[PDB]
Amino acid sequence: WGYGKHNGPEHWHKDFPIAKGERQSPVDIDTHTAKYDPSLKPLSVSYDQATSLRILNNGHAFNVEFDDSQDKAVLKGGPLDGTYRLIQFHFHWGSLDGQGSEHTVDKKKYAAELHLVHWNTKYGDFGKAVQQPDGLAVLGIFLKVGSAKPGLQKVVDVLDSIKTKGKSADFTNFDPRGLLPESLDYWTYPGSLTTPPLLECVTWIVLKEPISVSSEQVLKFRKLNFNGEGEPEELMVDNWRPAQPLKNRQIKASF
C-alpha cells in the first residue's frame, strides 16, 4: 500500500476491506451541522514529563516515538473516559500548500496535519488497544503556512538524518507542548486510523485552532523519501487520505 497511483487510497479496500467501513477517517468537518455539546469536558493534556526516544522514517511518514511504559505524557478529559498514553506523533503534508491535511473544515484543506497517537492505558499495551472501539485517541492539529514554529525546528533539523525508509535517529528531550495551539477547543467523532490496517478504534479530537509553520519548515518535510536507500527516489509528498463518508455519525463541538 502507498500513496501512488497504483497503490493509493483508492486501492486499500482490496487489502483492507474495512476501508469501506462504517466509521472510517478522515472526514469533512461541517461547522454548521457540527453539534455544540455542553456535556463536553475541557481537554486535559499533560506532557510535562514526556520522554522522546527516536524519530523514524517508516516509508509512509516519519514518527517521533515516546516512552509509554509509564503515564509520562497522557491525554484525558474531553470526550474521553480514562487515561490515554502518547506513543508517537507524525504528520501528513502535501506537494503544495493548498493540500496536505486529512480532515477538512467546511471543505477547506490545510498544508499539513499533526496526529498525536494515544492508547487507553485499561488495555495494557497498544496492540490490545487496537482491538477496542475506544482503544485509541488521536489528537489532530492543523498546520498552515505563516510564521515559523520555533518549537518545531528541532524536528526539522533531524530529517536529513532519516531521509529514507528504515532510517531512525536518537531523538530525546523533545517537548511536544511546543506543537500545541493556544486554544484547546475541539471537535470529536468516532473514526479510525487514516492509514492501514485502518482499524476503527479512534476517538478523534481535531482542535479548532491551527498552528502556523514557515514555508521553509514545510519545505524540509517535502525533501523526505518514501523509498529506501539505493532505490529510485520517490519524494514523500501527499501522504494523506481523502475524507470519507460520515455515514450517520455525528460531529460534536466543545464550543
Active-site residues, by number, are: 60
Could you tell which of Zn ion, Hg ion, none binds residue 115, using a CB distance below 5 to 8 A set by kind?
Zn ion
Cβ-based nearer residue to Zn ion, 76 or 241: 241
Cβ-based nearer residue to Zn ion, 1 or 37: 1
Cell 476491506: give the residue. 17
> Looking at beta carbons, which residue is closest to Zn ion?
115
Output the 3-class SS for the chain: CCCCCCCCCCCHHHHCHHHHCCCCCCCEECCCCCEECCCCCCEEEECCCCCEEEEEECCCCEEEEECCCCCCCEEEECCCCCCEEEEEEEEEECCCCCCCCCCEECCECCCEEEEEEEEECCCCCHHHHCCCCCCEEEEEEEEEECCCCHHHHHHHHHHHHHCCCCCEEECCCCCHHHHCCCCCCEEEEEECCCCCCCCCCEEEEEECCCEEECHHHHHHHCCCECCCCCCCCCECCCCCCCCCCCCCCCCEECC
Interacting span for Zn ion (CB under 5 A) from 34-42, 68-76, 179-187, 188-196: 188-196
User: Is 195 marked as binding a ligand?
Assistant: yes
Interacting span for Hg ion (CB under 5 A) from 101-109, 112-120, 193-201, 225-233: 193-201
13-23: b or e for each residue (b if 16 or more CB lie within 10 Å)? eeebebbebeb
User: Is 13 marked as binding a ligand?
Assistant: no
User: Is 103 marked as binding a ligand?
Assistant: no
The distance of closest approach from Cβ of residue 190 to Zn ion in the complex, given in angstroms and rounded to an integer, is 16
Residues 105-144 that bind Zn ion (CB under 5 A): 115
The distance of closest approach from Cβ of residue 39 to Zn ion in the complex, given in angstroms and rounded to an integer, is 28
Handedness of CA 41, 52, 88, 158 (dihedral sign): positive
Length of the chain: 255
User: Is 121 marked as binding a ligand?
Assistant: no
Cβ-based nearer residue to Zn ion, 194 or 225: 194
Cβ-based nearer residue to Zn ion, 47 or 62: 62
Neighbours of 58 (CB within 10 A): 16
Could you tell which of Hg ion, Zn ion, none binds residue 201, using a CB distance below 5 to 8 A set by kind?
Hg ion
Of 80, 87, 201, 205, the one binding Hg ion (CB under 5 A) is 201
The distance of closest approach from Cβ of residue 62 to Hg ion in the complex, given in angstroms and rounded to an integer, is 25
Residues 194-233 that bind Zn ion (CB under 5 A): 194
Interacting span for Zn ion (CB under 5 A) from 32-40, 46-54, 93-101, 187-195: 187-195
Interacting span for Hg ion (CB under 5 A) from 21-29, 31-39, 63-71, 195-203: 195-203
Instruction: State the binding site for substrate.
Output: 194-195
Which residues contact Hg ion (rule: CB under 5 A)? 199, 201
Which residues contact Zn ion (rule: CB under 5 A)? 115, 194
